[PDB]
Amino acid sequence: MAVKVAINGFGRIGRLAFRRIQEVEGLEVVAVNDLTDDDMLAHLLKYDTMQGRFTGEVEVVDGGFRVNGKEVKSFSEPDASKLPWKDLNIDVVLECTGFYTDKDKAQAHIEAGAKKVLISAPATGDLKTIVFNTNHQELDGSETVVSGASSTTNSLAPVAKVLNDDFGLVEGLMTTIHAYTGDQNTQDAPHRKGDKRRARAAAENIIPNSTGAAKAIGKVIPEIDGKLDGGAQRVPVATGSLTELTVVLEKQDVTVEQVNEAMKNASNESFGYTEDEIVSSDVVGMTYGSLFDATQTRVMSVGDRQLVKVAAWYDNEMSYTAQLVRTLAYLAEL
Amino acid sequence: MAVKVAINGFGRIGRLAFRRIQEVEGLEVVAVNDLTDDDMLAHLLKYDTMQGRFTGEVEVVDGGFRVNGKEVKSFSEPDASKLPWKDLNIDVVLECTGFYTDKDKAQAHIEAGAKKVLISAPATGDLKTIVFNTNHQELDGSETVVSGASSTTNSLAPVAKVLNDDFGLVEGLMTTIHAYTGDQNTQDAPHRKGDKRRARAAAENIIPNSTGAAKAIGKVIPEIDGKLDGGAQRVPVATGSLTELTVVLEKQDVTVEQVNEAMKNASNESFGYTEDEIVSSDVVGMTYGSLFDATQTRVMSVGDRQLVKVAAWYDNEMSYTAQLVRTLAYLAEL
Amino acid sequence: MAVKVAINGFGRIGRLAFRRIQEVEGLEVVAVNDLTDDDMLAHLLKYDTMQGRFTGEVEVVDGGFRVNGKEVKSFSEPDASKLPWKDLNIDVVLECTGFYTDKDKAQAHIEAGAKKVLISAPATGDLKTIVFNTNHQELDGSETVVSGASSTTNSLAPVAKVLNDDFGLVEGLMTTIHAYTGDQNTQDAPHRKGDKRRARAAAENIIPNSTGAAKAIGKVIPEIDGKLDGGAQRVPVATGSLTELTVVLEKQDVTVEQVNEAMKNASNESFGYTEDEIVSSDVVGMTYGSLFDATQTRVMSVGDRQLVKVAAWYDNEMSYTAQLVRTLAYLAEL
Amino acid sequence: MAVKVAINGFGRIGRLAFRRIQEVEGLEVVAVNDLTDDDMLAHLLKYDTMQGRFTGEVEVVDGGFRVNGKEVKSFSEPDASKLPWKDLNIDVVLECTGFYTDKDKAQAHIEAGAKKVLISAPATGDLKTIVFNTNHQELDGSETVVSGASSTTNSLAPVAKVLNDDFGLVEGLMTTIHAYTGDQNTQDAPHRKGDKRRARAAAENIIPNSTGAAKAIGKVIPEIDGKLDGGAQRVPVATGSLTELTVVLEKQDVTVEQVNEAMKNASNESFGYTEDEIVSSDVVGMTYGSLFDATQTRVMSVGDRQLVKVAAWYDNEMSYTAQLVRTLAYLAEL
Ligand SMILES: NC(=O)c1ccc[n+]([C@@H]2O[C@H](COP(=O)([O-])OP(=O)(O)OC[C@H]3O[C@@H](n4cnc5c(N)ncnc54)[C@H](O)[C@@H]3O)[C@@H](O)[C@H]2O)c1
Ligand SMILES: NC(=O)c1ccc[n+]([C@@H]2O[C@H](COP(=O)([O-])OP(=O)(O)OC[C@H]3O[C@@H](n4cnc5c(N)ncnc54)[C@H](O)[C@@H]3O)[C@@H](O)[C@H]2O)c1
Ligand SMILES: NC(=O)c1ccc[n+]([C@@H]2O[C@H](COP(=O)([O-])OP(=O)(O)OC[C@H]3O[C@@H](n4cnc5c(N)ncnc54)[C@H](O)[C@@H]3O)[C@@H](O)[C@H]2O)c1
Ligand SMILES: NC(=O)c1ccc[n+]([C@@H]2O[C@H](COP(=O)([O-])OP(=O)(O)OC[C@H]3O[C@@H](n4cnc5c(N)ncnc54)[C@H](O)[C@@H]3O)[C@@H](O)[C@H]2O)c1
Known part of the structure; x- marks a missing residue:
């Protein structure tokens, strides 16, 4: 059956x-x-x-x-x-x-x-x-x-879609503060793929690392192909992660409230929305692909020029x- | 004497x-x-x-x-x-x-x-x-x-000064991936200052948190007052921290190589420069107020519009x- | 009601x-x-x-x-x-x-x-x-x-009872490998009670520490009052703990099989029994007061003289x- | 040359x-x-x-x-x-x-x-x-x-030798609270040697595990062959370890002071002695093979019968x- x-x-x-x-x-x-x-x-x-x-x-x-x-x-x-x-x-x-x-x-x-x-x-x-x-x-x-x-692409896609559909994505940069995974070493040692950072004791370091999620987002959302890039910091939690995304938009007097509301409106089974001041262990075991955190939205305005930053949790x-x-x-x- | x-x-x-x-x-x-x-x-x-x-x-x-x-x-x-x-x-x-x-x-x-x-x-x-x-x-x-x-202001100031002197700072946003400190709790408990995040087990969580470093940078560098803001993610390393800064500049065809070289030229006893793929524990006990990491510089260009991201390590x-x-x-x- | x-x-x-x-x-x-x-x-x-x-x-x-x-x-x-x-x-x-x-x-x-x-x-x-x-x-x-x-007294008591009832307890010593608690400091700092070990960064150290559990067991089981003592090693897991007990018995040709079986027979809602090769995170959230771990029983025999060691898990x-x-x-x- | x-x-x-x-x-x-x-x-x-x-x-x-x-x-x-x-x-x-x-x-x-x-x-x-x-x-x-x-044999031998030479070793049991090593996995995953405990996330668990140090001590000190056994608890520190040894001696009215003094007298470049209330990070990078910790000595006496417990640190x-x-x-x- x-x-x-x-x-x-x-x-x-x-x-x-x-x-x-x-x-x-x-x-x-x-x-x-x-x-x-x-x-x-x-x-x-x-x-x-x-x-x-x-x-x-x-x-x-x-x-x-x-x-x-x-x-x-x-x-x-x-x-x-x-x-x-x-x-x-x-x-x-x-x-x-x-x-x-x-x-x-x-x-x-x-x-x-x-x-x-x-x-x-x-x-x-x-x-x-x-x-x-x-x-x-x-x-x-x-x-x-x-x-x-990837886990990160799933965290990012619904976020980037809303930003683009509702505001017009010009460009952006991403960092995921990401839990350490099986392909990091327990102690400083030779790494199989020759990566001098993934080589390092996983649970004792903030470790900068590359990820294609933001670069290869155009495969999931073609209309913003090439408009995103970024990387990762691997840190000592065993699972649970956070995507920060900093963007330039076409729409002009954008507010925290407008971005947050647009995100809530898109929420479903895959894209969650929270206003609680949660931390990474709170998402362990969660089944949303992406949990958008309204408490972390920020708009920097100098004259007519704005940077908009948002953040979404995921259990990788x-x-x-x-x-x-x-x-x-x-x-x-x- | x-x-x-x-x-x-x-x-x-x-x-x-x-x-x-x-x-x-x-x-x-x-x-x-x-x-x-x-x-x-x-x-x-x-x-x-x-x-x-x-x-x-x-x-x-x-x-x-x-x-x-x-x-x-x-x-x-x-x-x-x-x-x-x-x-x-x-x-x-x-x-x-x-x-x-x-x-x-x-x-x-x-x-x-x-x-x-x-x-x-x-x-x-x-x-x-x-x-x-x-x-x-x-x-x-x-x-x-x-x-x-603050430790964060010291990590940021020399970086922002170069960005502004050499390129013209329009605006930027900051995130410090920051080691946990003594004002976080060992276990989830009431926090003295009523902060529901600093309340949580420090060594088991990615913890978003506020910092005035970027907002109060204008006290150290007055000519960029009000042009930066940002926050922190407190993570489970006991010391050692990283400041990521994402900016919009006035100068136009900016490259990784230009930003990196400009940082190297400003280096001294307080502002270090590295091209090695280091991780947090590598800066524990160092005496630079800020160690600029050339491996982490990124330039997003879409048409004539650029975002520039940089990162500097510090032992908080x-x-x-x-x-x-x-x-x-x-x-x-x- | x-x-x-x-x-x-x-x-x-x-x-x-x-x-x-x-x-x-x-x-x-x-x-x-x-x-x-x-x-x-x-x-x-x-x-x-x-x-x-x-x-x-x-x-x-x-x-x-x-x-x-x-x-x-x-x-x-x-x-x-x-x-x-x-x-x-x-x-x-x-x-x-x-x-x-x-x-x-x-x-x-x-x-x-x-x-x-x-x-x-x-x-x-x-x-x-x-x-x-x-x-x-x-x-x-x-x-x-x-x-x-205390959490430790509850881990120990049912184990000590069986040992004494079935074998005759002469004397023993105890160590609990114990998760860190809220009365340990996040970073090295003055400790309120003046304990130079509890003063130390909790999640970065093996920290020897006292506990009355074994000394004050005679309050729970009077017939073995004064026959046990021991301490703790606080270690970097946030919850979950393990009591090791090393004892001298009256009965003479004691075996691993005899000790393990005696513990199984005494099992109930409060005193669990397992033969799986579990680790501390597996007992997080469990509701037995003590989980006897048969895989960890040891008997040292030299001539007619025996040391018996056992171990029981508990989510403190x-x-x-x-x-x-x-x-x-x-x-x-x- | x-x-x-x-x-x-x-x-x-x-x-x-x-x-x-x-x-x-x-x-x-x-x-x-x-x-x-x-x-x-x-x-x-x-x-x-x-x-x-x-x-x-x-x-x-x-x-x-x-x-x-x-x-x-x-x-x-x-x-x-x-x-x-x-x-x-x-x-x-x-x-x-x-x-x-x-x-x-x-x-x-x-x-x-x-x-x-x-x-x-x-x-x-x-x-x-x-x-x-x-x-x-x-x-x-x-x-x-x-x-x-092994690191553990080196921590144990000089302790065992004094205990036997000055007191007469009858039998003992050992536990080393031991830092995790590179043959533990970063995350729960199949373990190459088929060890279901070493398979588990190293930095998130108290992990019981075997070690031959105590059993194979008779190779280093033949006159106590077969008199010691024990195992390990691997805990989440990246290096630094402690051996606890519980023993029965021939000599009869043994005190804390006698044991500690006997250890001090044997101290040299390989076998250090301390009375400070140190913790595991204090021995990282140390060059003694074994650091005897007098603060941790214990003597349980019930009538004429005594258990003696001691502890020595080592950076594995x-x-x-x-x-x-x-x-x-x-x-x-x-
Ligand atoms: N956060 C995450 O861990 C995460 C999230 C999303 C996607 N992924 C992706 O999922 C994939 C698996 O990742 P994981 O984290 O579970 O790693 P893992 O190492 O836990 O699992 C890999 C497993 O594959 C087995 N294996 C290796 N080679 C094999 C072979 N060729 N034939 C059969 N089995 C083999 C290994 O024994 C191991 O059990 C990776 O591509 C990873 O990027 C991981
Ligand atoms: N990474 C860092 O820890 C860091 C970096 C830069 C600046 N700072 C700042 O420096 C200050 C201290 O930081 P810390 O981490 O060393 O904190 P800490 O808790 O480790 O040290 C504070 C000390 O002050 C003592 N103390 C409290 N009240 C006192 C009083 N009334 N009189 C005398 N002693 C008193 C406490 O016992 C404790 O020893 C804070 O303002 C912090 O923001 C901290
Ligand atoms: N593993 C464990 O945490 C554990 C296990 C067994 C027993 N215990 C015992 O339980 C008790 C609490 O342990 P805990 O770890 O939950 O500590 P905790 O700090 O997490 O909880 C103590 C709570 O009591 C509050 N409090 C302090 N003084 C108060 C007062 N004067 N009036 C009202 N509230 C006050 C604190 O704000 C805090 O919320 C302790 O006696 C501890 O020894 C703890
Ligand atoms: N605390 C400790 O880490 C410690 C203490 C005492 C003894 N030891 C022992 O030392 C040995 C190594 O332990 P470690 O902790 O350094 O492990 P490790 O994995 O860091 O070192 C092993 C190294 O050998 C390499 N290697 C594996 N097979 C090889 C081969 N056939 N040819 C050349 N290189 C090879 C690996 O790439 C790695 O660099 C182990 O036997 C361990 O028992 C370790």
Whole structure:
């Protein structure tokens, strides 16, 4: 009765996508693939430092593990092209390893027998990059490989859309104060990709770092292509992040109240709105893709010239996951 | 002939001031006042979590404690007007309690017999706010109460001065990714000043917060008064901070290379320059008031319209202290 | 009907006790007293760094705040003897301020009009110290002031009981690897109680510290009075803790299997048992007073002489709170 | 004249060994091997999060990098047997990768041309395990592969030796509250060795874990073989650690003062002694292999039966390094 999903890469995004799917009828994870044994997989599903204990029940069985009575098959195959996808009748592969972030590379799941692939990151190649409730409408059903964009792109897109539609975006710059992730080192050490900053002890530093979110926003919102750029500061929280966006607008005597109200009007399941003076732990586990913070809006006016700054929270884990899973469900139903 | 200094408030800034002063001939700390016993004071001078073990030798004696043979008298008097300053012949009080951040209030150290008061923070009232090597030249020696501004003002002033002198500052917005400080709570709890953000567990959160640095920059650099504003995100590192500044300039085809070179030309003892991909812990204990990071410069250009972003590191503790003590020496020598 | 509860001190234990009480029929919080405004109180109930967002709905109203339709009155009176307890018909005051940890002092709630006082810490004076499901049976209903003991006493008591009942306890030593609490400083600073270790940056240090739990265990379990002692290492996690107990027994050829089985047999609502390789974050928010961890049991045998070590987890916040509220319910129903 | 050292694995122990060797005449590092480029290597030697900026000057050159005028050749060869050791005339390889912790495996450096190998961890096979100033005297000069033991063994040995020599060791149990290391994950994720605890976010958890230090102590002190065991709690500090040891002694009316005095009498360059109430950050960068903390001694006495507990600090990085390099110097000079 259900769309058959396989999760490639049972990592933070992979396991949290598994949890979200439990809460979404019509979708079923029938297989999981990673580089480890069932014991570890089952254990990291039950127990989660920031996101809390898994609510149901998990036991290691023969082909894999059993979750709330349902069997999930598991695999330990680093080369996606060799996975038993045709055999298991996979509708969509959720690509969450970080190693298949390209159309041509992801094509391996298709050869292996899956109908479609949704990648949990920005991907190179000829494919659509989708932020749910910003541009998922651009999917027609004939896509075989699709990108879910990044946590940061999902935090930013709905914000940038409102700024542009309601005020006219001229240009802007972005900083995300971002929680540290699995690709930072625990202690100062060689970094696999040669990045001298990601090399550094993650939980002991403010670490400047690059991100394509603002540069590659034009893939989600074409009419503002090339008008945004920026970076990240990785800081010592384990999850939870904040996007600051500083912009020049066409409209002229813009106020705090006008920007805030425009944001509230656009609010939905993916784009939240708050006036509470919250902090990063308050968003851990939240399912908005972006939580716009009216307490942080600022307008600098000197004569007729204005800079407008806004800020939106996101749980780079669960917020991205909730968006990814919504896009999965929409993609599957075409 | 040594300048006699009393330190009011043997806290982070006060103890580090003491340490710096050991390295500057012509200055001598003769007394220290706080709310605690000698044992605690000596102990917190010897041992320092972020700044390391005190290099010299410290032992508790009768009137206070003895540092490398020299006696320091200590007091436990919360009412500054009751301190034996006239008796000890104090030239300058370094006011570091956080409770006398006002000209009229700080006047109490004068009544008590000190010649001058230097306040380790922004201060209200009719006084000069001094960032060394930006506007210390404004001191004429007739001042009795002076502000050394904030760690953030010191990180920003030299950057804003260059931007304005070389390019013409129209407007800008600031964000400091800032280490947590002693006025944040360890755990979520009522906050003394009623700030619902500073109330939250300091080491577990990205905490938005206000700062007057950018707004009160016009006190250090009058020709850009009212052209900057911004705030802070307090994050979980124990010291070390970064100021990001996003600006609109009058000059028109501005490049990364031009902005970077202009900063390098202004470098000195207070304003450092780096091209290394450093992170926050790399600036702990440094003595530049501001370390400009060329790796972080960005120029957004859409048609003829540009935004320019730059960033400068500072150890909110030691950088500010090194500036404070430079201003102290200069103020005393007039 | 409902037992009327007032909470004195709406801090970590106070707010979590409020939360627990929402889930326990027959109990109702009708008043709350602290040193802050309603805005702050409401806000700290909604938002909680380690414990998560309050599930219901909270709004500031006239006399205090409204939680899920029910009105809670709030007060800002530091002197308990002046609280309107007689007026509000208070059955039990939950004493959670940390400032009335003595029978004579807590007597102030009684004069003010409350029938009974339950203190959320160890307390001096002529009173019973109660760990639920170890010695709550010692309450007869004529008590007016009772102590709920400490988070550590609650972690230890059920473990010590089994060891003594099943094996004969000769002597032991204890260490709790304990999350940092609100009475530790954010940065190195004078400590109010003069403790040179609690003075130190909480989230940056392993900090040895005292605790009476093991020494004052004989108040909960008289038959082993004087046979235990030990201390704490406060470490940088915001909540969640682990007690290690090393003991000499009378019984002779003791095994890991015998100790673990004996603990399983004693398990209930208050004393959990696990064989999973969990870590501290997994116990955040848990409601057992003590979670025995079988994976950590060790027996050292040299000839006929044995040391036995065991370890039990506890969320120093929620685990203590669940125990406190169980004891409150039992105390009230007599 | 100078002993020629190659460092295999330019990691935390490898780079700090490099730093220590700068301070020790008669040793020279002439080559370094790792899995990364020179740019990374030089960069991680200049900047160190916990240990501070490298004091000298480092530049990337042709064959590797230049440190204070001296050339160090660098290699990127994961298979030790293929390194140019015979060609560079290597006297001792410092084995610091974590992958050659066995006599037979390490034998690859010897084939490659090195005369001797010192391994920076416990190692399996027929070799001596050496804690400097406890059993380095056991080296005769004919050894080709030697283990420098672990940081924990180095913290424990000199303590255990005094306890046994002066009191008679019957049995004991150990816990090290230990800083997190580079083999812990930044976020909950599959762990390469299948350890479900080491899999967990390092900087957010108290993580129980095994260590052979106490079990394999009999390799360093054979007369107490089989008398000690225990484990670790990994906690969120980035370096700095504490060993707690609980013991039963033959000597009967043992006091705190007797134990502390006995420790003081054994103090030297490897075994320090303190009566100050220090915390973990106070030992970062220290060069004692073990710092005995008299403030933490405890004696539980019930009738004639006593438990004795003691505690010694160590910087698991710099302490182990200082010991390792002392053993390297001694080994080389035979
Ligand atoms: N905040 C975030 O962590 C976040 C947010 C949005 C998107 N993403 C993206 O999601 C992807 C996954 O990220 P993550 O943070 O969960 O990382 P993660 O490291 O936690 O998970 C990666 C997992 O993939 C497994 N894996 C690696 N190579 C594999 C192979 N080739 N075959 C099968 N399994 C393999 C690893 O064992 C690991 O479990 C990345 O592209 C990342 O940018 C991450
Ligand atoms: N990064 C920083 O901490 C930083 C940087 C620049 C400026 N400042 C400013 O310097 C001031 C102090 O900062 P801090 O972080 O050192 O605070 P802190 O709490 O560490 O130090 C304050 C000290 O003053 C003592 N004290 C309080 N009232 C007193 C009184 N009435 N008489 C004598 N002693 C008293 C306290 O016991 C404590 O030792 C504040 O104004 C702060 O804004 C702080
Ligand atoms: N892990 C824990 O936090 C924990 C565990 C077990 C027991 N306890 C005990 O619970 C008590 C409180 O602990 P906490 O950690 O929640 O501390 P906390 O500071 O978080 O809470 C104390 C609250 O009491 C308020 N308060 C202080 N004095 C008051 C007064 N005179 N009248 C009314 N309100 C006052 C404070 O403003 C604060 O809101 C302490 O006795 C503590 O030892 C704490
Ligand atoms: N507290 C401590 O960190 C500490 C204390 C005592 C002993 N040790 C031991 O020292 C060893 C290294 O520990 P670390 O903490 O420095 O870890 P680390 O990961 O920082 O260092 C390991 C280094 O070796 C490199 N490497 C791995 N395989 C290699 C190969 N085959 N060829 C060349 N380079 C290779 C890695 O790139 C890395 O640079 C471990 O065995 C550890 O047990 C560590």
